[PDB]
């Protein structure tokens, strides 16, 4: 995936009008948009088609997939049918759940991102201790795309080590959760940014600002 | 929560027509339906309102919520606005992510179910070794409703031990994944059943048969 400006917009606004406006305003800067459940549960899967029609930006469905293999397969099918380029899947439910998603993505020609360690404080309780093994599981399964935390650069460094230079790594937690764009991009290929852009008075200026830095 | 016949239907059919037809066939037996992302992503969140209108069943949103606190809060907000009575939330992302869901549920008069240990084989890799501690975290947070695996009755037993007899416990993995209805109801208050009913030739007979076995 060639992410324009190394910057992925996390569009977690929950009404259609505002989400469309803000994404439109930053389209000169960003060609890849991460759409998750706050927007999808508010406006429907039809929102993915709408973004493709309006903007011709790649769409990553941030659905943190975390069910049994049979249900993960259905979720991936529904999400790729709607037009997502990629889906984010949790590794902590284990290898069979991840494989189920890889099998659908292989079949429909789309991508899986493996979420390895999360960026919020609570991630320290259980996920962090499992994360290096989760990332190594991903590599053994042939996963090529990963997600790891902007808020813990030492952990993001370790996860880049495990997955190698050829793997693709994107990282949330920049801005509102306290991660730095520059320090993150020493390990991640691209940064994910939501609130620092979408809650700005001038989203385009906020995006331009991050990019210029 | 009083689940009729201790049986919750997991409605994971992916089209509106089949989902409404199958649910209508078993409505005599079941007043609680677990609706997950397979149905919601195929048909929209309006399907929740439509089930309440047609059936008046309780709806548990099986969304395995597993994001950062701020995002979990927005998912719970959207879900309860859509008319879900309860939502399923993962414990593995930690206490702050579960507390975000509890906060919204409290504000809206809804219930959070904490998914401790999952029922599929992959659960053994990472989740199982954290599951007792996740359950203890639930107790510490004041969680009253939990989910644990029919496929590992000794783990389900341990979950019931940790949370005590006054917490409510529901359990998937019955039928298709190899769990036994009667054995699971030694420890769980209610069982979740999907494919054994909704893939049956006569779903009504499948549900009646299950209820008879218990
Ligand atoms: N993907 C993902 C996910 C995993 C993680 O560990 N940390 C996150 O912040 N996220 C998501 O990234 C986005 C971060 O947005 P923000 O820049 O903090 O506003 C949100 O959509 C959040 O749900
Ligand atoms: N809730 C939940 C979930 C957590 C888990 O550990 N195991 C499950 O099977 N489930 C869900 O319960 C249902 C079990 O359905 P079935 O009876 O195996 O067809 C599915 O909706 C599955 O996604």
């Amino acid at each position: 995936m060639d992410v324009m400006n190394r910057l992925i917009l996390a569009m977690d606004l929950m009404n259609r009008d505002d989400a469309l406006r803000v994404t439109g305003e930053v389209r000169e800067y960003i060609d890849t948009v991460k759409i998750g459940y706050p927007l999808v549960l508010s406006e429907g899967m039809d929102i993915i088609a709408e973004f493709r029609k309006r903007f011709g930006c790649r769409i990553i469905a941030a659905f943190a997939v975390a069910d049994i293999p049979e249900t993960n397969e259905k979720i991936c099918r529904a999400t790729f049918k709607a037009g997502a380029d990629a889906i984010i899947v949790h590794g902590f439910p284990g290898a069979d759940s991840v494989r189920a998603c890889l099998n659908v993505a292989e079949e429909m020609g789309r991508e899986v991102f493996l979420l390895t360690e999360m960026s919020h404080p609570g991630a320290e309780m259980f996920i962090q201790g499992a994360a290096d093994e989760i990332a190594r599981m991903g590599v053994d399964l042939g996963v090529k795309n990963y997600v790891g935390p902007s808020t813990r650069p030492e952990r993001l460094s370790r996860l880049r080590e495990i997955i190698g230079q050829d793997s693709f790594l994107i990282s949330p937690g920049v801005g509102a959760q306290g991660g730095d764009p520059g320090e993150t991009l020493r390990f991640a290929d691209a940064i994910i940014v939501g609130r620092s852009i979408y809650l700005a008075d001038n989203p385009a200026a906020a995006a331009a600002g991050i990019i210029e830095s």
Side-chain angles (χ1 to χ4, degrees), chain A residues 12 34-38 40-41 45 60-68 71-73 75-76 79-80 84 86-94 97-98 101 111-120 127 146-147 170 172 192:
Chain A
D12 297 314
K34 184 180 103 55
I35 291 177
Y37 287 133
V40 164
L41 298 181
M45 294 287 277
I60 297 169
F63 288 177
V65 180
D67 217 294
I68 65 169
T71 293
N72 279 8
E73 176 189 358
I75 291 173
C76 290
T79 297
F80 297 141
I87 193 165
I88 297 179
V89 174
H90 264 292
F92 74 81
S97 289
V98 181
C101 301
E111 305 274 71
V112 166
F113 287 66
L114 182 69
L115 178 50
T116 63
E117 184 167 337
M118 284 180 82
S119 58
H120 68 294
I127 289 169
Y146 297 83
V147 185
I170 62 174
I192 287 166

Side-chain angles (χ1 to χ4, degrees), chain A residues 173-211:
Chain A
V174 179
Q177 304 178 53
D180 183 76
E183 295 304 302
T184 300
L185 282 174
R186 276 169 60 198
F187 313 109
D189 294 286
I191 55 172
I192 287 166
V193 175
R195 283 167 284 174
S196 295
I197 294 166
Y198 73 66
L199 293 179
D201 290 335
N202 188 339
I210 293 165
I211 292 172

Side-chain angles (χ1 to χ4, degrees), chain A residues 7-198:
Chain A
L7 178 60
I8 295 165
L9 176 60
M11 179 32 67
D12 297 314
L13 289 170
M14 297 172 81
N15 76 97
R16 198 181 138 274
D17 282 319
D18 289 325
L20 288 168
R21 187 188 63 253
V22 170
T23 307
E25 285 175 357
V26 307
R27 201 225 309 201
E28 243 65 295
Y29 296 108
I30 297 172
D31 69 354
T32 306
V33 180
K34 184 180 103 55
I35 291 177
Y37 287 133
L39 180 61
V40 164
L41 298 181
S42 298
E43 295 287 352
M45 294 287 277
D46 288 7
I47 199 70
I48 294 172
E50 191 148 24
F51 269 62
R52 295 291 300 180
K53 179 187 166 94
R54 297 226 185 177
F55 312 119
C57 269
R58 292 174 202 90
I59 300 292
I60 297 169
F63 288 177
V65 180
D67 217 294
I68 65 169
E70 301 93 307
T71 293
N72 279 8
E73 176 189 358
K74 303 170 174 97
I75 291 173
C76 290
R77 278 182 196 294
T79 297
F80 297 141
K81 180 181 173 164
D85 293 279
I87 193 165
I88 297 179
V89 174
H90 264 292
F92 74 81
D96 53 354
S97 289
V98 181
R99 260 189 240 101
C101 301
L102 297 165
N103 288 346
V104 180
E106 290 170 39
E107 155 187 76
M108 305 191 63
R110 303 298 166 82
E111 305 274 71
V112 166
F113 287 66
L114 182 69
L115 178 50
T116 63
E117 184 167 337
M118 284 180 82
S119 58
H120 68 294
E124 287 179 336
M125 295 188 62
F126 305 109
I127 289 169
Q128 178 171 269
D132 293 350
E133 186 169 354
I134 293 167
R136 180 163 87 250
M137 176 191 74
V139 166
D140 272 318
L141 288 170
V143 170
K144 300 288 163 107
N145 302 291
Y146 297 83
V147 185
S150 179
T151 50
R152 301 189 190 94
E154 76 285 357
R155 303 291 309 138
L156 189 67
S157 179
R158 182 68 190 130
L159 299 144
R160 166 51 78 194
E161 288 175 353
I162 291 170
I163 68 180
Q165 294 312 323
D166 291 343
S167 292
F168 190 59
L169 173 57
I170 62 174
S171 178
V174 179
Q177 304 178 53
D180 183 76
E183 295 304 302
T184 300
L185 282 174
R186 276 169 60 198
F187 313 109
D189 294 286
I191 55 172
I192 287 166
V193 175
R195 283 167 284 174
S196 295
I197 294 166
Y198 73 66

